[PDB]
Design a protein around this ligand. Structure first.
Ligand code: MG
Ligand code: MG
Ligand code: MG
Ligand code: MG
Ligand code: MG
Ligand code: MG
Ligand code: MG
Ligand code: MG
Ligand code: MG
Ligand code: MG
Ligand code: MG
Ligand code: MG
Lengths: 293, 48, 205, 159, 170
RNA sequence: UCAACCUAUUCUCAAACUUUAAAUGGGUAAGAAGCCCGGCUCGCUGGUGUGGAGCCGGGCGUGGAAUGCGAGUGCCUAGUGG
RNA sequence: CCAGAAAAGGUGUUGGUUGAUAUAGACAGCAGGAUGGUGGCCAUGGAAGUCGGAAUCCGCUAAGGAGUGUGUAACAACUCAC
RNA sequence: GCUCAGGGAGGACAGAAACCUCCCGUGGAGCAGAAGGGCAAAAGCUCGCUUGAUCUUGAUUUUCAGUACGAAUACAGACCG
RNA sequence: GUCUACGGCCAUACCACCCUGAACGCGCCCGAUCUCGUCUGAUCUCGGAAGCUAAGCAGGGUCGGGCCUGGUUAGUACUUGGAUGGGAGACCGCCUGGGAAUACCGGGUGCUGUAGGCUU
């Protein structure tokens, strides 16, 4: 045979990693360099802009760390986009830009700095950086959090970054990772970045799949056909959504329904029940052995 | 001609006969070894 | 060959075992520690007598083997060749040192490994013999005549434990009949009320 | 003679405790230290930048200087017959608040609170902590049954 | 009944040719693999140095290539038409994968060429199941449970069912 | 069968082994240089008269464990270093 | 401190623990028995209870070991357990 | 971006050991060396770019008389990666 | 009742196997044109929503291993201070205070912060 490797001594000596490390959600080596404040700043908050891209959503939220747990100050999800007129295609780059913009303008609405630092009204995709206006309250700066995303060129985390930057946040960045930075020649095609923001990567592919095989087109873009969006509706829809977001970025909470108090799972049984279980198990095994023998 | 090498025998008796005096408690301690761009700030806050 | 054992008697030094640092240690000449009919069950040698030290001293590994041979040679005469089980329960680990002279003097003094010795606390079982309950005085006399090989002071105590176990003699057959401990050779295995229930089923089946 | 290394004889002193190896938890980092905080020193092996020396492990001092990652602190270190209030720069992992101060702080606020109280009453409360006094007289109720007799147990050489 | 995501499927097929020496043998052992696969293979270096085999540290001694999907199923059925759709009981791993080897490459489709020479090759079929990407995705990695993993008899019944393969006892 | 191997058991150990882990011991704290308000200044930090620090002005004594005792401070200096 | 002793022993004497047997008459002590199969099997030149290896029963019994010791070439003769 | 030492099951020649693959794997590896500490989306391994191995004034720690040198720790001003 | 995003303390949260998961999620899943990266669209990146709790994950179970917290072991081992105490010594008893750790026997099996949903 072979020695059992997950031995009782193995479980005695075994040390766990952190809970979020075991779940996989948190990179602590990146987290400590992101989130810790210099000690001569003395309880001054250090705001970070967390982007998490999901299968059906994009979570964009701004947070600073206290001891008992980091406070979220503002949030903006991709499933708030049908309020602003994006019915469908919620996990793509354009929706990432829209929710970054919504996070930015909603935070500026919370702090009362809407009419100052309005940022790029006309989307271009250049180097944009919010200069702080003297005599006014200074521009909000925060630091981009990507978590565990491989930050290569064209990432929707950098799409949400461009959304917050054009919304008016002073996030430090550079145009190496935006879609359009040509790798071999080291320049940045802002028109390509702009059509990626406005979604012509999806609309051009939609016009592509309309050509050769339309049931594959319906298999790819199903609810685009159901929600009546077409490649000539595409760019104007995102521009109307940008105008709607920059017009009214405040967020309502849904009124809470009164609970029925229904226990949807199975609660933890006491020690009396699980001692009685094995008592009648031993009684059952003995009374089933004595007759079968 | 060997010798006794190291000892700490009569040393504690020699210390306490004048006493191990604790350092001089004094308010307004100095500002040497403080962060110099903090102390620039402090000196401009004093001069204005 | 070796110097008298009144020299290396008291537990003076720190326990200095045969290890990575002390190398070249000559082997302690006791190497058989238990013998007799050591291949036996627990049911057939209940009685057990312990030679218990009563001094904090060092017993040499040569005196251990001398006393083992003296306690074996009596019971092969007395109890027959398979009617007992000696277990010496002090393995020697403390290696002792020797500064031998040939003229340098005392300068540069740290001994070479000479022998191995066993440091024995107050009230500790040196040797223990299990046999039938009818061979009680044979254990007493065997341990008595094996006392004279050791230095110091030893008493002889016949325990209340069933053989080489940690369970009492008035409770051993009770707990066997209750199936709370099961034989596996020289000793027993204690079954708690804590395992998974299939191990309960497998012993009650 | 002994070597005079910076880290001689600290194989258990800066060692991490059992099953507490690995990543430093971040609430050590997220705790702000202002000027004049009474604060303890306990070096950590996982980080090596800003190690306080092994004569300061377990000493309590007072913060005088705060930098980005580290803290200056005046600790009392005893040199053969005297005690120097000397100042050292310690990185933020190796240092932790003293709870020997906040019990005094809450006692100051507590007895100034009850000195503001009972001032309009005229009630004179006691504020100096007296030591644990001798126990006063009290009836022990032998309710019913008698005290149980104890005897020295007879000797049996159980070994 | 049946739940269609525990339907058993292949997830990769790995080829190698370990020529055991570098140079013109090995660089054509790669050229036969790109004839098989339509993609460039990768030279594996030697991990240690054993003078008995004639290899040294970091010598290019083997060439390997992994294939997925329909091209993998094509190369698999070519090799099984070589091996007569018949394998053995011992050819199957405990974890559920299997594999075998072919003694010369001219049988499974490759025209014999004198500049290439002759080369034997290995298959290894890594059977998957929809859900085995949990083990190697980056963000929330986890093990894949106990019901879901492949036994050995599930691989045996998969091979006896999919291709009507003959498992001989041995 | 003899062995290695594997699984629960068992006898005996460590200055340069260790999960646990004392006694004696080592820091710090036991208020007026402390608290509690109001207002300035700053070229540092800053979503924010945010943060921190320094200044002015005011109010608080039941002097905040026990015991004991005057304390601080500076020159010059012999002998000693088996 | 500190100026001298141990293992081991003693039917000297004094305490103490534990277990036996004893008016169904013990411990001594003086007397009477101490038998048969049988000179039990292996062996050995000879071993008859008595140098050796394993067994170790029965009968008659108030009671006697296939023998505790002295003896013998081997017996005999004596002695002991009972 | 990866995960090590080792082990189990497999795969033409191939074996005890060459290469491919699956699974277990709290470190049993590696970090130039002596040992000790420390380390797992790293301090290890592999890639890309590099010269913070640079210019400069103070403070502090270590040995210590509370002196040097060596070594190291916080800062600060430049130029940079 | 519960989940997601980010957390705090880091096993009362780990590990193995089994059972159940309404809704919203989180996932698995379908693809490779574009951004991106590989031998390989497996991973990473990008575009989706045909299918599905099978797995991840969540809740629960195991006279479960572990871990955590108590009892016993134990006023035992060790120990501050003391004696013109014993003992040839080794070491031991006492006075004054402090006081552990296995084996063995119980009990527990994540709490919680900020933000947003679901149970209309
Ligand atoms: Mg990172
Ligand atoms: Mg001298
Ligand atoms: Mg002599
Ligand atoms: Mg010595
Ligand atoms: Mg890294
Ligand atoms: Mg390095
Ligand atoms: Mg895919
Ligand atoms: Mg599932
Ligand atoms: Mg399920
Ligand atoms: Mg358990
Ligand atoms: Mg919660
Ligand atoms: Mg209803």
């Amino acid at each position: 045979f072979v020695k059992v490797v997950k031995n009782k001594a193995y479980f005695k000596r075994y040390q766990v990693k952190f809970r979020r490390r075991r779940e996989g959600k948190t990179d602590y080596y990146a987290r400590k360099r992101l989130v810790i404040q210099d000690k001569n700043k003395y309880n001054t908050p250090k705001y970070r802009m967390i982007v998490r891209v999901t299968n059906r959503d994009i979570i964009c939220q701004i947070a600073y760390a206290r001891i008992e747990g980091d406070m979220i100050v503002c949030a903006a999800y991709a499933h708030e986009l049908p309020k602003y007129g994006v019915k469908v295609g919620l996990t793509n780059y354009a929706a990432a830009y829209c929710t970054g913009l919504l996070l930015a303008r909603r935070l500026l609405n919370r702090f009362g700095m809407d009419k100052i630092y309005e940022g790029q009204v006309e989307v271009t995709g250049d180097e944009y950086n919010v200069e702080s206006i003297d005599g006014q309250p200074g521009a909000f700066t925060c630091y981009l959090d990507a978590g565990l995303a491989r930050t290569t060129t064209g990432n929707k985390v950098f799409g949400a970054l461009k959304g917050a930057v054009d919304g008016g946040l002073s996030i430090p960045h550079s145009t190496k990772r935006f879609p359009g930075y040509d790798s071999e020649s080291k320049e940045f095609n802002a028109e390509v970045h702009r059509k990626h923001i406005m979604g012509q990567n999806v609309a051009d592919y939609m016009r592509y799949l309309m050509e050769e095989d339309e049931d594959a087109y319906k298999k790819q873009f199903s609810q685009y056909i159901k929600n009546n969006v077409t490649p000539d509706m595409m760019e104007e829809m995102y521009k109307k959504a940008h105008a709607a977001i920059r017009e009214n970025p405040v967020y309502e909470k849904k009124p809470k329904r009164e609970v029925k108090k229904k226990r949807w799972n199975r609660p933890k049984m006491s020690l009396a029940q699980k001692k009685d279980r094995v008592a009648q198990k031993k009684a059952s095994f003995l009374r089933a052995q004595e007759r079968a023998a | 001609a060997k010798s006794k090498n190291h000892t700490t025998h009569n040393q504690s008796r020699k210390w306490h006969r004048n006493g191990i005096k604790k350092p001089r408690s004094q308010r307004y301690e100095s500002l040497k070894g403080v962060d110099p761009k903090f102390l620039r700030n402090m000196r401009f806050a004093k001069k204005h | 060959g070796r110097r008298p054992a009144r020299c290396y008697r008291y537990c003076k030094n720190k326990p200095y075992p045969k290890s990575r640092f002390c190398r070249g240690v000559p082997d302690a000449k006791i190497r058989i520690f238990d013998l007799g009919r050591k291949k036996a069950k627990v049911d057939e040698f209940p009685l057990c007598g312990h030679m218990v030290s009563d001094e904090y001293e060092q017993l040499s590994s040569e005196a251990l083997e001398a006393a083992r041979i003296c306690a074996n040679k009596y019971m092969v005469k007395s109890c027959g060749k398979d009617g007992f089980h000696i277990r010496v329960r002090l393995h020697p680990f403390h290696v002792i040192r020797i500064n031998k002279m040939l003229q340098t003097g005392m300068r540069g003094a740290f001994g070479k490994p000479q022998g191995t010795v066993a440091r024995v606390h107050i009230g500790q079982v040196i040797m223990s013999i299990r046999t039938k309950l009818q061979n009680k005085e044979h254990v007493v006399e065997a341990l008595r005549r094996a006392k004279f090989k050791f230095p110091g002071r030893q008493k002889i105590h016949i325990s209340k434990k069933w053989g080489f176990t940690k369970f009492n003699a008035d409770e051993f057959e009770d707990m066997v009949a209750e199936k709370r401990l099961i034989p596996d050779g020289c000793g027993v295995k204690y079954i708690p009320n804590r395992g998974p229930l299939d191990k309960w089923r497998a012993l009650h089946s | 003679t002994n070597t005079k290394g910076k880290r001689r004889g600290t194989r258990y002193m800066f060692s991490r405790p059992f099953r507490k190896h690995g990543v430093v938890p971040l609430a050590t980092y997220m705790r702000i230290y202002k000027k004049g905080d009474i604060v303890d020193i306990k070096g950590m092996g996982t980080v090596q930048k800003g190690m306080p020396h092994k004569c300061y492990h377990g000493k309590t001092g007072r913060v005088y200087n705060v930098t980005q990652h580290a803290v200056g602190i005046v600790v009392n270190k005893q040199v053969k017959g005297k005690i120097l209030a000397k100042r050292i720069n310690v990185r933020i992992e190796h240092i932790k608040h003293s709870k020997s101060r906040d019990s005094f702080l809450k006692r100051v606020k507590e007895n100034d609170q009850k000195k503001k109280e009972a001032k309009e009453k005229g009630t004179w409360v006691q504020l100096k902590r007296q030591p644990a006094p001798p126990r006063e007289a009290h009836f022990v109720r032998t309710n019913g049954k008698e005290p149980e007799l104890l005897e020295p147990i007879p000797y049996e050489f159980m070994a | 009944k049946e739940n269609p995501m525990r339907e058993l499927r292949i997830r990769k097929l790995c080829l190698n040719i370990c020529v055991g020496e570098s140079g013109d043998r090995l660089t054509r052992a790669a050229k036969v693999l790109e004839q098989l696969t339509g993609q460039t293979p990768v030279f594996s270096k030697a991990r240690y140095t054993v003078r008995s085999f004639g290899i040294r540290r970091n010598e290019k001694i083997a060439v390997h290539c992994t294939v997925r999907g329909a091209k993998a199923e094509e190369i698999l059925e070519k090799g099984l038409k070589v091996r007569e759709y018949e394998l053995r009981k011992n050819n199957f791993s405990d974890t559920g994968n299997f594999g075998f080897g072919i003694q010369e490459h001219i049988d499974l489709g490759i025209k014999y060429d004198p500049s290439i020479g002759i080369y034997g090759l290995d298959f290894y079929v890594v059977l998957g199941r929809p859900g085995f990407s949990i083990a190697d995705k980056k963000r929330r990695t986890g093990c894949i449970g106990a019901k879901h993993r492949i036994s050995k008899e599930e691989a045996m019944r998969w091979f006896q069912q999919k291709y009507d393969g003959i498992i001989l006892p041995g």
